[PDB]
Amino acid sequence: AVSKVYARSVYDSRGNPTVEVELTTEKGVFRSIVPSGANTGVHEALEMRDGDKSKWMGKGVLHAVKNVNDVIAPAFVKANIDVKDQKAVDDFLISLDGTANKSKLGANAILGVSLAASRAAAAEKNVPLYKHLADLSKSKTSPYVLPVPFLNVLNGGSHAGGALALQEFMIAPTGAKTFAEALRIGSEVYHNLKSLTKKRYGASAGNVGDEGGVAPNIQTAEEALDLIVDAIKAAGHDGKIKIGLDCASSEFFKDGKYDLDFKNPNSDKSKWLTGPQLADLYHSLMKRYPIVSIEDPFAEDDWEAWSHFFKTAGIQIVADALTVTNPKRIATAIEKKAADALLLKVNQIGTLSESIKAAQDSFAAGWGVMVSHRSGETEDTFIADLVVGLRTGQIKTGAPARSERLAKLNQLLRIEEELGDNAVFAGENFHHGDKLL
Amino acid sequence: AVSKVYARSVYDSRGNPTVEVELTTEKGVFRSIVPSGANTGVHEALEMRDGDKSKWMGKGVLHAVKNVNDVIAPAFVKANIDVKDQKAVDDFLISLDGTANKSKLGANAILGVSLAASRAAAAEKNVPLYKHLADLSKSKTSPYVLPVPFLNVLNGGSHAGGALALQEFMIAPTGAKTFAEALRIGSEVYHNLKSLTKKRYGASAGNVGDEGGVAPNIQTAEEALDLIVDAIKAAGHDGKIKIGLDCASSEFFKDGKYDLDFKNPNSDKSKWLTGPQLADLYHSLMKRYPIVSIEDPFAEDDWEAWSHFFKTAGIQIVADALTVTNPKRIATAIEKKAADALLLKVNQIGTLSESIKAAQDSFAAGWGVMVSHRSGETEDTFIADLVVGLRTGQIKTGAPARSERLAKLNQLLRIEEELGDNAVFAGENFHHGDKLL
Numbered sequence: 080a081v082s083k084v085y086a087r088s089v090y091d092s093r094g095n096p097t098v099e100v101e102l103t104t105e106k107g108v109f110r111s112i113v114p115s116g117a118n119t120g121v122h123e124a125l126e127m128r129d130g131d132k133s134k135w136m137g138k139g140v141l142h143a144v145k146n147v148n149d150v151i152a153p154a155f156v157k158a159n160i161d162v163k164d165q166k167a168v169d170d171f172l173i174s175l176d177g178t179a180n181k182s183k184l185g186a187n188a189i190l191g192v193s194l195a196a197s198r199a200a201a202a203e204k205n206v207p208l209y210k211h212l213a214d215l216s217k218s219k220t221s222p223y224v225l226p227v228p229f230l231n232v233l234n235g236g237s238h239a240g241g242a243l244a245l246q247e248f249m250i251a252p253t254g255a256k257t258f259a260e261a262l263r264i265g266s267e268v269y270h271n272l273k274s275l276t277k278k279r280y281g282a283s284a285g286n287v288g289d290e291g292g293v294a295p296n297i298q299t300a301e302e303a304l305d306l307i308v309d310a311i312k313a314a315g316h317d318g319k320i321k322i323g324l325d326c327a328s329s330e331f332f333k334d335g336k337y338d339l340d341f342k343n344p345n346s347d348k349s350k351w352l353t354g355p356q357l358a359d360l361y362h363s364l365m366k367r368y369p370i371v372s373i374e375d376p377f378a379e380d381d382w383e384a385w386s387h388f389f390k391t392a393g394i395q396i397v398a399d400a401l402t403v404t405n406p407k408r409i410a411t412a413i414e415k416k417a418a419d420a421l422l423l424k425v426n427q428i429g430t431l432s433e434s435i436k437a438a439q440d441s442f443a444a445g446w447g448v449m450v451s452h453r454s455g456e457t458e459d460t461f462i463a464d465l466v467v468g469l470r471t472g473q474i475k476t477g478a479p480a481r482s483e484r485l486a487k488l489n490q491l492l493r494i495e496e497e498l499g500d501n502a503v504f505a506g507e508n509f510h511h512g513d514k515l516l
Numbered sequence: 517a518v519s520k521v522y523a524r525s526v527y528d529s530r531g532n533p534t535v536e537v538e539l540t541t542e543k544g545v546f547r548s549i550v551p552s553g554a555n556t557g558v559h560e561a562l563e564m565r566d567g568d569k570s571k572w573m574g575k576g577v578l579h580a581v582k583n584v585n586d587v588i589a590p591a592f593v594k595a596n597i598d599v600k601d602q603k604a605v606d607d608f609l610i611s612l613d614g615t616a617n618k619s620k621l622g623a624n625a626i627l628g629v630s631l632a633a634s635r636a637a638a639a640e641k642n643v644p645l646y647k648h649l650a651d652l653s654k655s656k657t658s659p660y661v662l663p664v665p666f667l668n669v670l671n672g673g674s675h676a677g678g679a680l681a682l683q684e685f686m687i688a689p690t691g692a693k694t695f696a697e698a699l700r701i702g703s704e705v706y707h708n709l710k711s712l713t714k715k716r717y718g719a720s721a722g723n724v725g726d727e728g729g730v731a732p733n734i735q736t737a738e739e740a741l742d743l744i745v746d747a748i749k750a751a752g753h754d755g756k757i758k759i760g761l762d763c764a765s766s767e768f769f770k771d772g773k774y775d776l777d778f779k780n781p782n783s784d785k786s787k788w789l790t791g792p793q794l795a796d797l798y799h800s801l802m803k804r805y806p807i808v809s810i811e812d813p814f815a816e817d818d819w820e821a822w823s824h825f826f827k828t829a830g831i832q833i834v835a836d837a838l839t840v841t842n843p844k845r846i847a848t849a850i851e852k853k854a855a856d857a858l859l860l861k862v863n864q865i866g867t868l869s870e871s872i873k874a875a876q877d878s879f880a881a882g883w884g885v886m887v888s889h890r891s892g893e894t895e896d897t898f899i900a901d902l903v904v905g906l907r908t909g910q911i912k913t914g915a916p917a918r919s920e921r922l923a924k925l926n927q928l929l930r931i932e933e934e935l936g937d938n939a940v941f942a943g944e945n946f947h948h949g950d951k952l953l
C-alpha cells in the first residue's frame with residue numbers, strides 16, 4: 080500500500096531544476112527523477128515551469144512540485160491503488176489532470192509519480208525493474224535483448240559554430256558480440272575522435288556539449304563524416320562501428336525549402352533544397368559512409384518528403400520531431416509510410432503506460448523503437464531498464480561522457496551481467512530487436 | 517555478516533574505466549564506485565591501470581577488479597569482520613596489501629571495499645550514511661553543519677586553450693542562509709556566466725570542461741576574474757558570492773620557478789616567477805577580488821614557498837597535491853605552517869579510516885577541511901554524506917552541470933531536507949565549519 084507521495088526540486092545535468100518524486104510503501108522509498116522537457120509546444124505533453132524570472136532564470140518547478148504534494152499525493156494515497164497495475168496508476172493520474180497535454184498538473188508532476196510507482200511495483204514483486212517492465216509490456220523474455228547504444232560523438236546544427244547544418248553524429252557498435260564489448264570499442268572510438276578533434280580544431284574544440292559529444296567548427300557533413308570514419312579506423316574498429324545521424328531538419332526548414340547553410344545570415348536562397356534534392360544529398364552520404372540510421376531527415380510536418388525518401392532510403396529512418404511521442408502522429412507516420420522507427424521520449428508523453436503503448440503500436444507496424452534521453456538528463460537510470468524491458472535493441476542516451484549519460488550505460492553493463500545466458504546483444508539486428516530470435 | 521564481495525568495471529564521467537564494488541550482507545547489496553584524478557600528485561596512493569594498449573587506451577582496470585574478486589573478496593568473507601568497525605575493515609585491507617602506497621592491490625581495489633563496508637554498516641545500524649559517518653568520526657550532530665559548495669565555473673591551465681595558467685576558478689555562495697538557497701543562487705551565477713561567455717567568446721566557448729565549468733580561450737587571470745564578477749553582478753548576487761582558486765601550480769612548476777606562460781612553447785624563461793614573486797601575484801588578485809580560498813598556490817613539495825606565503829596570506833590556504841590526504845604529509849604541513857586547510861580526496865589515500873584520520877588531524881591543528889570530488893567522477897554520492905558526517909562546512913564537487921556533479925549536490929539537498937532543524941548551513945563560517953555552534 081502506498082503510504083506517502085512526495086516531491087522536491089533537484090537539478091538536471093544542465094543545472095536547471097527538475098521534479099523528483101518519492102513513493103513510500105511497505106518495501107521502502109522509491110525515487111524517480113524527471114528529465115527536462117518542453118513547457119510550450121503544439122502536440123506534446125507540457126512540463127510546468129514557474130516563470131518567475133527572479134528564481135532559476137524562470138525555470139523553477141515549484142508549482143509542479145506543489146501539484147504533486149498538494150493535489151496528486153492526498154488523492155493517490157486515498158485511492159489505495161495497486162502499484163503493480165501500471166494502467167490503473169496512469170489512468171488515475173491522467174483523469175486527475177483532465178487535459179490532453181497534461182498542462183493542468185504538469186507533465187513533469189505526472190511522470191514522476193508514474194515512474195516511481197513502477198519501481199515500487201518491481202520491489203513488491205521482488206524482481207529487477209527491467210523484468211517488471213517486460214511484464215507490463217508483454218515482451219519476450221527468452222531471451223532478453225540488450226541494446227546497441229547510439230553514442231553521440233559530434234554535433235552540428237544549432238549546437239555548433241560551423242556551417243554544418245546536420246545536428247547529431249552518432250556511432251553504433253553493431254559489430255560487437257556483447258554490450259560490454261560494444262561500450263568498450265565505442266568508448267575507444269570516442270577518445271580517438273576527441274584527440275583528433277583537439278589536434279585539428281584546437282583545445283577548446285574538445286569541450287563537450289549537453290550530451291557529451293564534441294562540437295568543433297565543422298563546415299560540411301563530409302568533413303564530419305570523414306573525421307568519424309577516420310577515428311573508427313584509427314581505433315581499429317572499421318567494419319564493427321556504424322553511423323547514425325540526426326538531421327533535425329525542422330531547424331533549417333524555411334518557406335517550404337531546406338537551407339543547408341541556415342547559420343549563415345546571407346544564405347543564398349537559390350541554394351536552398353527541395354524535398355527530392357535533400358533526399359539525394361542523403362543518398363550521396365549513404366553511398367560514401369556506413370550510415371545505418373537517419374533521424375528527422377525532413378521537417379516536422381513535411382509528410383510528403385518523408386514518404387518520398389522512405390521509398391528508396393533502404394536504412395532505418397527515425398521519427399523525432401515528426402512524431403513527438405504522440406500516438407495520433409505515430410499512427411499517421413505509420414499510415415503514410417513516412418519512417419520505420421520511433422524515437423521514444425517517456426516525458427514527452429508523460430506516463431509509463433502511454434510510453435509502453437507507443438512502443439507496442441510501433442512494433443505492431445514493424446517499426447523499430449529507439450529509447451531516448453533528453454538534453455537535461457539526471458542520475459536516474461530508468462531508461463536503461465526500460466530499453467531492456469521493451470526489448471527494442473537500440474538506445475540513444477548520449478556520448479560515453481557525462482555521468483547522466485554513463486549512468487544508463489553502466490546500468491546496461493549491470494543488467495547484461497545479471498541476465499547472463501538469458502540475454503543476447505542486438506548487434507546487427509538492432510532495428511527489429513523486439514522480434515530477434 | 518558479509519556474505520559476498522564483488523567488483524566490476526564501469527565508466528567514469530570522462531568515459532574511462534573505473535572500479536565498482538558491491539558488498540552483500542543480510543541487509544542487501546551495497547555499491548561504491550572509485551573516482552579518478554588527472555595529472556595526479558606524485559605522492560597519491562597507487563591507482564592501478566592495466567596498460568594494455570589494445571583495450572581502453574591502456575586505461576583498463578581489469579587487474580584492480582581481479583584483485584577484488586580473486587584476492588580481497590575470498591579473504592574478506594572468511595575474516596569474520598564487523599562492518600560497523602570501520603577501523604577493523606581498513607586494518608584488514610591494509611594488512612593484505614602490506615605496502616605504504618597500496619601498490620600490491622591498488623588503492624582503486626581497496627577503496628571500493630572500504631566505502632561499501634561503511635554503507636553496509638549504516639544499513640545494519642538503521643541510520644543514513646551521513647549519521648554513520650558522524651559516528652565513525654566522533655563528530656557533533658546537534659546540529660549537523662551543511663557545506664558551502666565551491667562550484668567550479670571556469671577552467672584554465674592545461675584544461676583550456678588561451679594563455680591562462682591558473683587551473684580552476686570557483687564560486688562559493690557563503691551569503692546564503694540554507695544549502696538550497698546557496699545552490700539556487702550559485703546556479704543562477706553559472707547560467708549568467710554561460711550566457712556572457714557565449715556572447716564574448718562565441719557559442720562554442722559555452723561548451724564545458726571535465727568538471728562542468730566553461731573553458732574558453734582566456735588570456736589572463738584578471739580577464740577570468742572580471743568575467744566571474746560580471747556574472748555575479750548580472751545574476752544580482754554581488755556580496756553573497758565569494759571566489760576560490762585552485763592554481764594546481766605543480767603543473768607549471770619548473771626547477772624552482774613558476775612559468776605562468778607554460779602553454780606557450782616559446783615561453784620567456786627570464787619571466788618565470790620565483791616563490792616570493794608568485795606570492796605577490798596572489799596578493800594583487802586578493803586585493804581586487806573577493807577571493808576567500810586559494811588551493812595549491814605552490815608546488816607539491818615546494819614547502820618554503822608555501823610557508824612564506826602563509827605568513828601573510830590571511831585567507832584560507834588549501835593543500836591538495838601537497839598533502840594528498842595523507843596524515844604523514846599533513847603533519848609536515850602543520851609543522852611547517854604551510855597551509856590551513858586540507859582538500860580531502862578519499863582515493864588519494866585509499867581507505868575511509870585514513871581519510872577520517874586526515875580530517876581529524878587537520879581539525880585538531882585548527883585547519884579547515886574541504887571534501888573533494890575527482891575530475892573523473894561517477895554517479896556515486898559518497899562525498900555528500902561524508903562532508904555532512906565530518907561537519908566540515910565546505911565541499912568541492914563541480915559546477916552545477918554534468919550529473920556526476922549534480923548527483924552530489926542533489927544528495928545534499930536531500931540531506932538538508934531530512935535534517936531540517938537538526939542542521940545549519942555553514943555560510944560565512946565555512947573555514948571552521950567543524951567548530952560552528
Ligand SMILES: O=C(O)[C@@H](CO)OP(=O)(O)O
Pocket residue numbers: 115116290399452453454455
Ligand atoms: O533534441 C533532443 O532529442 C533532446 C535530446 O538531445 O533535446 P531536448 O531534450 O532539449 O529536446
Ligand SMILES: O=C(O)[C@@H](CO)OP(=O)(O)O
Pocket residue numbers: 552553554555556684727762764836859888889890891892
Ligand atoms: O585538482 C583537484 O582538486 C581535482 C578536482 O578539481 O582534480 P583531480 O581530481 O584531477 O586532481
Ligand SMILES: [Mg+2]
Pocket residue numbers: 325327374375399400
Ligand atoms: Mg532529434
Ligand SMILES: [Mg+2]
Pocket residue numbers: 762764811812836837859
Ligand atoms: Mg586541486
